[PDB]
């Protein structure tokens, strides 16, 4: 990839642009997504090149595809998935997204995570805003900016952050593992069944429980106490209990009592087929 051939189409959201890669200057070439860095240190740049090598290393159906790279001034290039983040897509198109449909995306995400697991990668940022929609029937894990490789010996890894998706051990000890991704997956499943009703978002609900008057750096500590005393995100409207139970089992204070992404994949599919 040569950067004089990337024609800028629009800003998408660290920064991501929609571009056309068009060496024939023909407007024929394909539209792609281009990630780069806003204000870049050699530290950010060193983690960005890891991300790039984590993405190239992954070839799965529910993981956005690596296309290439281009420089010097690094840009990451990936397939353009035309419907954007599952988080906005759900807000936009709730009327034609039914529960069978929620469960479809759910199982596509587990399958994507399962695959990550077999490479010993830890995602760290599982949330609906990092899931891309390719079309009505397919979603993909679409960002890997916080993903980490487990060390050969240890089966966990230590490190602003998305605290309302974090497992207790990540909040208290900065421990990230397949088990903390599962905790987070539970929050992703919660999200879906709330249909992203803004005041049912995990931050709004947790702040309600903590007290909205709580501020600054104490939020994280009160969140830690809530989770220790088995405070949890409530069952959202219309969520069938069987499905809430999957969430609550993902949100177990005990790390190895949490389900595997295999367990979850299969348990979601079986539930799917009975509605
Ligand atoms: C890497 C990538 C991003 C996309 N598509 C996309 N990305 C968006 O936001 C970026 C920041 C993003 N990247 C990765 C994610 F996982 C989630 N979001 C959009 F906003 C959007 N839209 C489509 C056209 O209307 C605007 C929304 N479409 N395809 N491939």
UniProtKB/Swiss-Prot annotation:
Domain Protein kinase: 6-269
Active site: 125 (proton acceptor)
Residues that coordinate or bind ATP: 35
Cellular localisation: Endomembrane system; Cytoplasm; Nucleus
Disease: Chromosomal aberrations involving JAK2 are found in both chronic and acute forms of eosinophilic, lymphoblastic and myeloid leukemia. Translocation t(8;9)(p22;p24) with PCM1 links the protein kinase domain of JAK2 to the major portion of PCM1. Translocation t(9;12)(p24;p13) with ETV6.
Function comment: Non-receptor tyrosine kinase involved in various processes such as cell growth, development, differentiation or histone modifications. Mediates essential signaling events in both innate and adaptive immunity. In the cytoplasm, plays a pivotal role in signal transduction via its association with type I receptors such as growth hormone (GHR), prolactin (PRLR), leptin (LEPR), erythropoietin (EPOR), thrombopoietin receptor (MPL/TPOR); or type II receptors including IFN-alpha, IFN-beta, IFN-gamma and multiple interleukins.
Quaternary assembly: Interacts with EPOR, LYN, SIRPA, SH2B1 and TEC. Interacts with IL23R. Interacts with SKB1. Interacts with STAM2. Interacts with IFNGR2 (via intracellular domain). Interacts with LEPR (Isoform B). Interacts with HSP90AB1; promotes functional activation in a heat shock-dependent manner. Interacts with STRA6. Interacts with RHEX; this interaction occurs in a erythropoietin (EPO)-dependent manner. Interacts with ASB2; the interaction targets JAK2 for Notch-induced proteasomal degradation. Interacts with MPL/TPOR.
Domain remark in the UniProt entry: Possesses 2 protein kinase domains. The second one probably contains the catalytic domain, while the presence of slight differences suggest a different role for protein kinase 1.
Listed name of the protein: Tyrosine-protein kinase JAK2
Coverage span on the entire protein: 844 to 1130 of 1132
């Amino acid at each position: 990839f040569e950067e004089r051939h990337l024609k800028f189409l629009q800003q998408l959201g660290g920064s991501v642009e929609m571009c056309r890669y068009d060496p024939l200057q023909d407007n024929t070439g394909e539209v792609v997504a281009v990630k780069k860095l806003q204000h870049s240190t050699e530290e950010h740049l060193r983690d960005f090149e890891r991300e790039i090598e984590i993405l190239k290393s992954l070839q799965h159906d529910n993981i956005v595809k690596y296309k290439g790279v281009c420089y010097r001034n690094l840009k990451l290039i990936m397939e353009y998935l035309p419907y954007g983040s599952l988080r906005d897509y759900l807000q936009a198109h709730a009327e034609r997204i039914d529960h069978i449909k929620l469960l479809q995306y759910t199982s596509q995400i587990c399958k994507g995570m399962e695959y990550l697991g077999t490479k010993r990668y830890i995602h760290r940022d599982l949330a609906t805003r990092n899931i891309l929609v390719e079309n009505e029937n397919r979603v993909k894990i679409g960002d890997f900016g916080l993903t980490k490789v487990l060390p050969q010996d240890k089966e966990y890894y230590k490190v602003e952050s998305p605290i309302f998706w974090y497992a207790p051990e990540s909040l208290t000890e900065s421990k990230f593992s397949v088990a903390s991704d599962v905790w987070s997956f539970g929050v992703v499943l919660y999200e879906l069944f709330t249909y992203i009703e803004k005041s049912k978002s995990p931050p709004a609900e947790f702040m309600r429980m903590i007290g909205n008057d709580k501020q600054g750096q104490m939020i994280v500590f009160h969140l830690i106490e809530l989770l220790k005393n088995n405070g949890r995100l409530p069952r959202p409207d219309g969520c069938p209990d069987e499905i809430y139970m999957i969430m609550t089992e993902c949100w177990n204070n005990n790390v190895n009592q949490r389900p595997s992404f295999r367990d979850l994949a299969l348990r979601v599919d079986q539930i799917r087929d009975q509605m």
